[PDB]
């Protein structure tokens, strides 16, 4: 069964919503059990996603929220069904009878959309993702695997039982994973479905690669990151080593995100109240047979933008005006959100452009082992008895 | 299993439908398994294809489960089947001249 599962470890949200810590360790090792784990069909994901929706509309409030309002202005004229129902043309109240008789949608059934605009306050609120130990409610358990080559699916034999989860931090980041927990033995490559080339391949690292974005000057809204080259070559080398020792059997080619809405083209992350959109072309070039860009101090030019697209729902949001001082945003590169474009028969190679944009996928790497299970302590046995 | 015809250059419309009212993750593909769009939460990508710029999807319908696709500047190089995947609905719509 799947339930509401509360929070947390150690003045707005966690005071109102969460509990204090517990004196960990708290684990029970099980013996000859084999509990079937699937990561891609978990229902700890949606509860946590809605829980961070409950975070960031109470901790970092944008000044103006521009959301859709798509409604079926006066009248419920669409009715059960059929055709010859008008409404719209001149302003929003002229005639326009439509022809259907089965229905399929107008402007299936009709909706005239709208834009609710909302202005919220704006204190210049600070932010820090605190660790959230998700603790199970009364009469429930959180099962946990232990093998380090855990592919999400498959069965796990070394199944342990905790009462409450490990250190989990709310870090939204497209294009790249930040402040995540790494792997003990070796790197792991996943999918919901390999050969389907449309599910976000998650790669979780074992080498704690670091990243440094700072804002220097002479400009107000300019910043940049630096990453250690020859840590990045080793990381990409063992990533392509894994991807060549398992799934192809082909040639590799890396590239950048090939367009769309620009919060996926740039590495986007919030830090200190600033929404960094950093260019992520020069990181991805490892066209490598298995056998001019600043080769030691690799610089990522990064804009600060403050009319952002909501990952929370659909729509945009405007925050407070920017900061004056300089901000340190040293973090851990921990993983990658990569996609494919499988083909095409001459190649031979595979173009391996990155993806991302889901924030639920960025929770499946930290909701990594866990499965909510409900105990029932009642049993019936036919003994003698006396 | 629908066939839609646009002559040349004009806009044209394709629809997935979804009865969940959540704006869940979904994808469009061509016949030879190259992406054209993709939802990523509540964002918009494009496909690394021959339709990077001219492909478009109106966004506000996504909460209603209506998953559209607007293709612009039609010509001879669009005559192939496009396929939804939302949850399992592997449809087959076709465009012609």
């Amino acid at each position, epitope marked *: 069964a799947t339930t509401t599962l509360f929070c947390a470890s150690d003045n707005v949200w966690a005071t109102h919503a969460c509990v204090p810590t517990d004196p960990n360790p708290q684990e029970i090792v099980l013996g000859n059990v084999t509990e079937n784990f699937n990561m891609w069909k978990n229902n700890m994901v949606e509860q946590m996603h809605e829980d961070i929706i409950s975070l960031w509309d109470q901790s970092l409030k944008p*000044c*103006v929220k*521009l*959301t*859709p309002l798509c409604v079926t202005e006066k009248m419920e004229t669409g009715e059960m069904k059929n055709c010859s129902f008008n409404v719209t*043309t*001149s*302003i929003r109240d*002229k005639i326009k009878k439509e022809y259907a008789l089965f229905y399929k949608l107008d402007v299936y059934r009709l909706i005239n*959309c*709208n*834009t609710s*605009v909302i*202005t919220q306050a704006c204190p210049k609120v600070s932010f820090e993702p605190i660790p959230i130990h998700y603790c199970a409610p009364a009469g429930f358990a959180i099962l946990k695997c232990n093998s380090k080559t855990f592919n999400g699916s498959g069965p796990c034999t070394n199944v342990s039982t905790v009462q409450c989860t490990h250190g989990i931090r709310p870090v939204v980041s497209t294009q790249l994973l930040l402040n995540g927990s790494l792997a003990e033995e070796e790197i792991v490559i996943r999918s919901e479905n390999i050969t389907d080339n449309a599910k976000t391949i998650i790669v979780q690292l074992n080498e704690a690669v670091e990243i440094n974005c700072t804002r220097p000057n002479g400009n107000i*809204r300019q910043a940049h990151c630096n990453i250690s080259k020859a840590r990045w070559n080793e990381t990409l080398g063992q990533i392509v080593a894994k991807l060549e020792e398992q799934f192809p059997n082909k040639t590799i080619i890396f590239n950048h995100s090939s367009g769309g809405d*620009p*919060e996926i083209v740039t590495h986007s992350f919030n830090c200190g109240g600033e929404f960094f*959109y950093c260019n992520t072309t020069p990181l991805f070039n490892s066209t490598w047979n298995n056998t001019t860009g600043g080769e030691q101090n690799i610089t990522l030019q990064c*804009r*600060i*933008k*403050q*009319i*952002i*697209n909501m990952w929370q729902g*659909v*729509g*945009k949001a*405007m925050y407070a005006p920017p900061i004056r001082g300089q901000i340190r945003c040293s973090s851990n590169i921990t993983g990658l959100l990569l996609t494919r474009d499988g083909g095409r028969d001459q190649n031979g190679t595979e173009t391996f452009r990155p993806g991302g944009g889901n924030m639920r996928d960025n929770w499946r790497s930290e909701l990594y082992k866990y499965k909510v299970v409900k105990i029932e302590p009642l049993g019936i046995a036919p003994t003698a008895c006396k | 299993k629908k066939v839609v015809l646009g002559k*040349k*250059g*004009d*806009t044209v419309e394709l629809t997935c439908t979804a009865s969940q009212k959540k704006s869940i993750q979904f994808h469009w593909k061509n016949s030879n398994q190259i992406k054209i769009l993709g939802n990523q939460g509540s964002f918009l990508t494009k496909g690394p294809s021959k339709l990077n*710029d*001219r492909a478009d999807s109106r*966004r*506000s319908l996504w909460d209603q489960g209506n998953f559209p696709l607007i293709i*612009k*500047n039609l010509k001879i190089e669009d005559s192939d089947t496009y396929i939804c995947e939302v949850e399992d609905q592997k449809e087959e719509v076709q465009l012609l001249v």
Partner: antibody
Amino acid sequence: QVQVVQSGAEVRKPGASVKVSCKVSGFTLTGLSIHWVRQAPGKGLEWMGGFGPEENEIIYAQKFQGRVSMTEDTSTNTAYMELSSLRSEDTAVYYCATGGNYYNLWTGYYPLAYWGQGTLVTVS
Amino acid sequence: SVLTQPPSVSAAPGQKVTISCSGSSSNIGKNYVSWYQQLPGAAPKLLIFDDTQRPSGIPDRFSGSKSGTSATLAITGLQTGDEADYYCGTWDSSLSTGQLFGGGTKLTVLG
């Protein structure tokens, strides 16, 4: 119905500044809904600034690189365009142009439904 | 970035006449076209937005359309009432940066 009323006529010098106000009455101010367009007498319109699908810049149209500043006060329901370093063909007519309450969510291509009357800035 | 449209527009008042706005794929062959109306001396307004939708003042007197890489505007037969300037206007999606406007249309009648 919303009425948009610009600032008054304002005479400046070569190298001075100008702060054109834009009173808006009829909706509440967002931070995107106002573009600014110049017309010179003798040619067509020209877009000074406004917002589109790049996600912060009220974009400056490739000739305003260090002399312009555009800031929009949502509490007073009045916009305030600024332009410094007035030159030989900064002698034109300004327009505080405004898109209405129609299907805005995306704010890249929305046109300018509501308008000021046209302020005149002359350089003497 | 260029928006080539014919300057001199002269015809008989009353016979449904059309002019175009020509550009490129990054300018007009991708997005919506907004026709603006400017009286010769007064402040401009818009005529047609999203190529089919109109505000409360204009609607039925004009007809706009989008044909591939060129727009089309037409008057449905007035005389000297809307004899003014018109300006196609759209945004540029390339890093040729922003919102653009047409060069010039001198719509006059025979009189």
